[PDB]
Amino acid sequence: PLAAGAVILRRFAFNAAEQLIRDINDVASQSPFRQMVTPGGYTMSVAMTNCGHLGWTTHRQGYLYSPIDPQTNKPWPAMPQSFHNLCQRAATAAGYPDFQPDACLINRYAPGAKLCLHQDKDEPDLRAPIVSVSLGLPAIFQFGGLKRNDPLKRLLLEHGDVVVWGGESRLFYHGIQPLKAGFHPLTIDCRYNLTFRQAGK
DNA sequence: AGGTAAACGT
DNA sequence: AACGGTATTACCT
Numbered sequence: 001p002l003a004a005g006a007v008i009l010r011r012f013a014f015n016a017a018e019q020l021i022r023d024i025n026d027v028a029s030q031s032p033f034r035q036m037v038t039p040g041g042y043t044m045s046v047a048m049t050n051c052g053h054l055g056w057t058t059h060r061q062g063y064l065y066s067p068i069d070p071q072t073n074k075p076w077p078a079m080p081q082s083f084h085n086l087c088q089r090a091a092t093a094a095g096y097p098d099f100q101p102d103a104c105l106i107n108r109y110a111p112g113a114k115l116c117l118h119q120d121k122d123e124p125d126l127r128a129p130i131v132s133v134s135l136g137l138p139a140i141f142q143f144g145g146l147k148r149n150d151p152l153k154r155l156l157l158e159h160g161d162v163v164v165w166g167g168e169s170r171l172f173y174h175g176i177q178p179l180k181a182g183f184h185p186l187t188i189d190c191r192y193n194l195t196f197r198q199a200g201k
Numbered sequence: 202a203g204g205t206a207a208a209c210g211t
Numbered sequence: 212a213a214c215g216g217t218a219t220t221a222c223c224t
């Protein structure tokens with residue numbers, strides 16, 4: 001297995017993917033993708049949006065899970081039932097049957113886009129897993145340990161692959177290497193990732 | 202005290 | 212281009 005408390009479910013979301021993608025488009029029609037600017041002033045290469053009660057955002061003074069889209073000043077769109085259902089099935093298969101996400105971060109990767117090694121650790125209740133769904137073009141996912149310099153595993157994540165981490169591995173560093181250009185029948189020229197969290201109480 | 206931002210050179 | 216420095220600090224609460 002990937003790590004203690006972590007698993008990859010290869011092609012788990014393959015059958016659900018078309019509906020998931022129609023739903024990504026619906027969410028982005030209300031809260032559009034945007035490349036966020038870090039506190040340090042750099043524009044991220046990944047374009048993002050959110051759905052559910054809480055959305056990950058940067059602001060000048062740090063990061064924040066907020067109920068309001070700072071670009072539209074309206075609540076993030078509701079989490080699509082398709083998203084919620086897939087998440088629940090994936091979490092159950094991964095051994096986390098009780099997971100209730102309240103936040104879905106939607107990442108869009110154009111060629112060259114990356115996410116440098118980081119930890120998901122600003123959720124108040126770290127008991128809950130992360131469920132991470134890959135769609136479209138393939139990407140190299142890095143998955144390490146509690147320390148930034150712990151040895152990395154590098155795993156190709158393909159369309160429909162779902163990765164779940166929690167328990168002992170909940171705070172592990174992970175990231176995405178710059179996306180290779182290519183074609184996919186469903187997304188054409190990009191990769192999407194759906195990241196489900198319980199971000200509030 | 203402790204939290205936490207982080208996305209260039211070799 | 213895989214690995215690691217940087218936050219080895221400057222601020223908040």
Ligand SMILES: O=C(O)CCC(=O)C(=O)O
Binds near residue numbers: 105134174175
């Ligand atoms: O795109 C991925 O596979 C990972 C995304 C991620 O780590 C995040 O959204 O926090």
Ligand SMILES: [Mn+2]
Binds near residue numbers: 118119120174
């Ligand atoms: Mn992450």
